[model samples]
Target chain A: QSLKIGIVGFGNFGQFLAKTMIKQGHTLTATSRSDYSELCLQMGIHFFRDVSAFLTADIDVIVLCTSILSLSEVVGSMPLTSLKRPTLFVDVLSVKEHPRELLLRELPEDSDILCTHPMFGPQTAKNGWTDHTFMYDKVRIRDEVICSNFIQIFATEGCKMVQMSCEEHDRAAAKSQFITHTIGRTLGEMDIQSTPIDTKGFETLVKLKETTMRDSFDLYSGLFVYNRFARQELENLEHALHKVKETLMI
Target chain B: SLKIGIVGFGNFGQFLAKTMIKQGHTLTATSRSDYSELCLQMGIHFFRDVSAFLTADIDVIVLCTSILSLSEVVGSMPLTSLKRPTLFVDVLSVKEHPRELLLRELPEDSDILCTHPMFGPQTAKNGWTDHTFMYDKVRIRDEVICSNFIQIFATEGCKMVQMSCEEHDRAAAKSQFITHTIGRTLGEMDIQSTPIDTKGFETLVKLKETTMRDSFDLYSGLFVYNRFARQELENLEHALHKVKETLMI
Candidate 1:
């Protein structure tokens, strides 16, 4: 059966998710700071300008689509108790632990919470999300039907559904994604341009740098400041660069 | 059908030899150390003495020595004892150094071609198709012999870039040197492949391993000898600093 999914913070990512969910035969209604009612109309999805009205609309699942930094402010200010039923609260944040902790403390005990990070988005998964990773932490889910039904959306798209703890996700992501963004940002800052004789390896870096610049610095910062292990990885990169210089210095 | 004498029998030299032999070129090898058994197994003659290798009827002498030893090795080789005016080609990473050195040292009649086959043993393990082959015919009077030698790389489907040695150094300083710098820096970090690897980060991890496989002396030669490398290195440092500045308070 198709589930009624309510998305909070209808921005670039919200619209991205809505397009897929609509295609998969699910009902979607979204609330945001700004109104996207016209776009929602064309897509045959409901758009609510008010949070209290959104909560009372009786959504089976409430997906938090807010930015990592704005998540707390957006969630805390909302009248959460107005949620009609014991709904499933899911977040699609890049860093898992922050939202996982926030949703657990604020949501009603009977309300199920699932923290998921679909490791690709409009940029990386533009064609489709086949074979990309979809990491989740089922912090509190007694209602298996609603939770699995929600995940079925991604599962059907050939995503590698990884059921890992939020703690492990942060640790591994610090070294992998966080470090990757740091390198790309550093290259962007350098204004590294393609020379006449670029190697295959260097060309990849140039493309990586270009992709990274399109993403907001806040996204890069959120991956850094929110993920607890990110500082050490940044330190390691600097130390590594310094160490490489020593070989040529003397 | 040319007699090509390879002046080094290291991994890279052996790699080049495998392709040349497959292409039906006669191969004789001489190195500072002996590889008699390995040469025999490969069905190539190994010369113990440099003079004896020079005395052989070699149409071309390809120097495949490390950048650090290029001066000493080229100095000791018996150029006058060479049976005929042959092509003195070098496959060193840096271009202008070998071009100037070969021209200064070799007989005026001997052709000097400076070439850098960008791929090596690890990169070209699959095959060298679409790989870049850069060459500079510094002093080539023998057009037929020169084109035939360049054809060796072209036959393997290399994109033959007939560039000047000076221009090659300038471009290499930007692209190749930058790539090696990042690879070596990441190698210093000892970054292993992680479970949650991004597509981009995996490239860096693979490049790190590739960089470590090459010798430290080879990497050092790139920095110590190339004039343009130092500026690019400084640009990397400045770039990193500005990135950190943006992130921090």
Candidate 2:
């Protein structure tokens, strides 16, 4: 059977996944809230403004490429009738816990839901994502046939898959994402406006400040504010700050 | 010919005068109570106790080295009654105030002079004095000019030049005095505590620490007490802090 795929959302990741699927000769349907119907028409893929219209259609696989907050809501709102068949549902969200838990509860008993977290961005997506690694957690139902096909699809796309429990994924993310954002925020708060040419140490610190401040704030807040393990990381960083101060004679 | 002598018993000034006189110049001398016996053995040519020493006839004069605590004692001592050819000189700890005070207090007929030799025992006695410099404030001295012997003796060893009192004090205290003191303190605090695998910025701190640790006490006395012109270092450090803070952000 020809692999038919429907992608939710038309964000950067959604556009990337849709373009890659079409290039790979897969039949594609995409959902967007905007009037990108003309562009979709020109691209020769099925597109709809409403997620329900896109989800109700017959598709072998559905990819959810949306923000974590929206992904959780969309998975919860998906109609039971539309999920009647054993379809492979994949999600690519940064923080995995809430979305995975919601989907595990809401997805139909026959649905093979695979939660995927791509460890890279759109820049890495073009060359077929094979060598790039992804984390996948099988939720509610598991089938070797579906899992094997999912693995082969990722392999063909040049993507490596790592299997993790939903809990393990968020816990690891708490350390990496949450701690980095904390360092960025501390540096930002302490920064006083000054010219860059004055001192070399200050220049290096400012370069670190600018690079990390922009991209990770939302995902970072979600991980830190929502994850159970976040407090421990913050406490550890606080201890490090104390140790740094102890070294200061002033 | 003038007979010059040093009256106090400190290392730097005494060693300087000894080296000068060792080249066949005549110098009278007296020493502190602690060093008086040793002072006699050095064949100072004329040695007397402090009270009796002031009566000895001398022409170009020299004050013995002493710390700031003895400034008043040395400054109040009597000048020799010797005539027009006499020049009273001092090689005190600092130049500005002491030089001015000496010029003001000495008799008008007697020429009061000031000179500072920047060498210490470590360099002066070991014949490394040639590698160093001396600061003199006297514009014209009969002994410095008329004596071909003095000219030949100076040319054979070290270079001596005159500097304004203000310039000498500012340069010495700021660059040498204050810098060494601050570096020494930082070195003492950080020695051996730094990690061996330092890189980049850490290496600069480590280098600073190692370079200043050994001479900390000596530099501290110079920086904290002797040098009045060292206030500029605080301003320099503040400017450095501002630049570093700006770049770090």
Candidate 3:
């Protein structure tokens, strides 16, 4: 029997995953708050806007791709007790610790909760779901069988999977995501004010500004404010500037 | 006629004295310690030392190729009593308040003047005297007959003349001192650090290093030791940093 896959949140990631599953011959049942009824008509995938419609659906696996702030609300609203058997539920969020803890409390005893983080975005993936590197944290489930299957699926799509704790992932992201995005934004702002006419040094700064400045500002704001390690990294940049000043004076 | 004696026998002074005499005006006598024998051999007038030359028959004086430290020699060795109705001139790398002092301390009847030659050693006369020299003075003597003669020679040779000492020092500090010092020092550094196998960046560094390395010591000494160059460098560096920071932010 074919596995019934349910996807929640039909934004960029949600639509991408649904299309990839359909292309791979998996039966997809997706839910979106937006007007995805037209998109469903075009792609020939079963779509629902109501949470109640998902209860009766024969979904063996449900994937959550919503914002971290809304993940807890979606979990509370999910009819976890109505799942027929040991259905597997997975979440794809950058910070997995809070969501994994909420899933353990809200999910039924018969259901399995698996937290997975895809390292790359939808644009970087080659074959939609096939081209992704996943980090799996098996919270309250038979993790070994699920991890093996997940790894095989990811490896076949040319991805390298790394295993880390949810807390570790969020902490490391403070430097990689928070600091990089902040610097890129600062450079972008500087470029916007300078009306450069020459292609020498002026155009180079503009190019760096244009290429790195177009990401989700809310995502960056959340990463900077919510993450504990963000302030220290910013301090390090200030310290570097201090050293440069001293050297120049000498 | 103003009787002028050149004190140094270097390429710079030799060229100046040669051109001055070529115009049919002559110093009463010229003095040299190192090249006195050579000067006599060239059928040019010569004296063994400043004492003999100053006590002899000179009226106007020019210190042409003297180094910075030798300014003391020029200031101290001249016999002021014999220099009546004379112009005491120096062509050194610096001109400032010291120039005013040189002008003031000489005999009341003497006119003290300062000059700077902007040409390199290679362009000094006898080989090619086609470059420019600038003179600075508070007053010009009405009786000096050589002014029109010297100006005619300079103009005929496609050379330039500027009368402002302040402008000459300022322009030289920017155009010559800073450029030579930075280029030469960077070039020398790259020469010392050249690698066997170089990449594109390394090759660019090497090219820059080779271009200016040999000129560092001379350029830096002139830039750092010249009377007005240090101030100019400080000002230029400040302006460059300010502009860079404003653009970067």
Candidate 4:
């Protein structure tokens, strides 16, 4: 019942996820490029400095929580043969297709792969995972029992488990999620702030600007570069703006 | 307790009529379009001609015509037909335009008050309580009549802002004008509701819906009548241009 989950990247999101996994009584071990042993120790998680050694210790599920830009390089440097068993691999990346392809090719044929994207972050999911969407594709799940147990962690917290293909997710995410970030970052570049007599609508834009600022530039650019359909959405936004201005000339 | 004669009975003029009628103030209205059937139900005297409406014993003349028509409508008004030295009040979205026009056109003894009820039927659908009401007593000779006319809005729980016409224009240009531009631009895109709709985009989509719901006549009035609005539109364009420059680079 207790799965030893070893998290690959113990950053803001990975640590946020670890807190909940620990609360659910799962044994957690974390290894990252940076040292987080002290923090991991406080949360009762075992921290490994080396990815090879981290793989040596037995872990039922290895969660890939690295950034979208660095996931491929980070995974390449890891010695997956060092994994004690044919562990279940789960990636929590924003763009699913890139990780789905990479994980399927690199991970051992015996290893089970589950590509997921928890459609939330520290800002949205700070309160709890209740009512949050947990999207996953059972790309190569042979160990049905372990996969079912691993998924119970989110199901227990009332998450909406959306079972879909990685390709389908990337298409939908490009227009909605990617466009959201693009607009937010554009407002940031404009340096927009709330005025004294701001209308209710302007207040929303100011908050979007402030919220987008909290996210890293790397995170924002990654959404642009990785998603194939994202460029068209960006062009559509620019074209719409251009048309709005032409009406002024008339 | 003042008799207010409204010059136009369009959507905004009609909206204000309900509140004035409830306040026990007698209202007589004239508009380019016909609202005779509707005005009769509300106990309002709807005059099809301006001369007939102007001849009434009205204590105040409230100009509620479309912003673009203020010049032609006010110029055509028979100010001499008024029964008293009535206070002229214009509830235009743009302040300075009406302020200058009313001051130059009204009789020497006539008083002028320019105000903008910072809400519409869609926003103030429930009630006008706590809504913003900005005004300027551009030329006040009939102090008693002007204050009593203002009491209609103040007593109804509006945040009465007594500011200069130019100052209100400047503040409005920065916030309201810019807000309209952004909302309109997003509407032009015809954005569909998304499945994974983040909380951020949802707000913009709602803004687009409400703003686009407002008449294009109102939007053009905000641009053409308010001198500062054109500059704000340019500012928005520049801001967007700079944003794209960086991303494209």
Q: How do the residues B1-249 of candidate 4 rate in per-residue lDDT, one tens digit apiece?
A: 978888888888889989999999999999899989998898889999888888788898888888888999988888787766878899988889999888888887888899988887877788888778888989987788888989998998987888888888887877777778777877887876655555666777788888897777677787887788877777766765675565555
Give residue A223's lDDT in candidate 4 (0 to 100).
77
Cα lDDT of model 1 by residue, A66-119, tens digit: 888889999887897887788999999889889888888987889899998888
Q: Give one digit per residue, the lDDT tens place, for model 3 in B67-130.
A: 4434466566765647346666776655554365566666666666666655534333243344
Task: Give me the runs in candidate 1 sitting further than 4 Å from their true place.
Answer: none
Which candidate should be chosen as best, given TM-score against the real structure? 1
In the range A1-250, model 2's lDDT, one tens digit per residue, is 2468888866777777777667777788888656678878877888878777777787878888866656656666666575546888888777778777777778776788887777655533455675666777877546666566655666677666678887787777555545544544544544423331112222333443454454444454555655677677666645543342233222
* Model 2 complex DockQ against the native: 0.02
Q: Could you tell me the TM-score of candidate 3? A: 0.46
Model 3 stretches astray by more than 4 angstroms: A1-3, A126-132, A143-147, A191-214, A238-250, B1-249
Model 4, stretches more than 4 Å misplaced?
A: A1-3, A129-132, A145-161, B149-151
lDDT of 3 at B92: 63
lDDT of 2 at A5: 80
Can you write out model 2's per-residue Cα lDDT over B1-249, one digit (the tens) per residue?
346666665555466666666666676676554565555676665454565566666555566545343456555566544444566666653567556666666666665556555545543446633533444545345656334333423554655556666666665554344334333433433423211111222322443453343233334334444455445444434433443343234
What is the lDDT for B177 in model 1? 86
lDDT of 1 by residue, B1-249 (tens): 789999988978999999999999999999999999999999999999999999998899899998878999999987888778899889998898898888888888999999999888868898889888999889989999888989999989987888988888888887788889989988888887755566677877888888889898888888877888999889888888887777675
Residue B11 accuracy (lDDT) in model 3: 55
Root mean square deviation (Cα) for candidate 1: 1.9
Checking candidate 1 for backbone clashes, the offending pairs are none
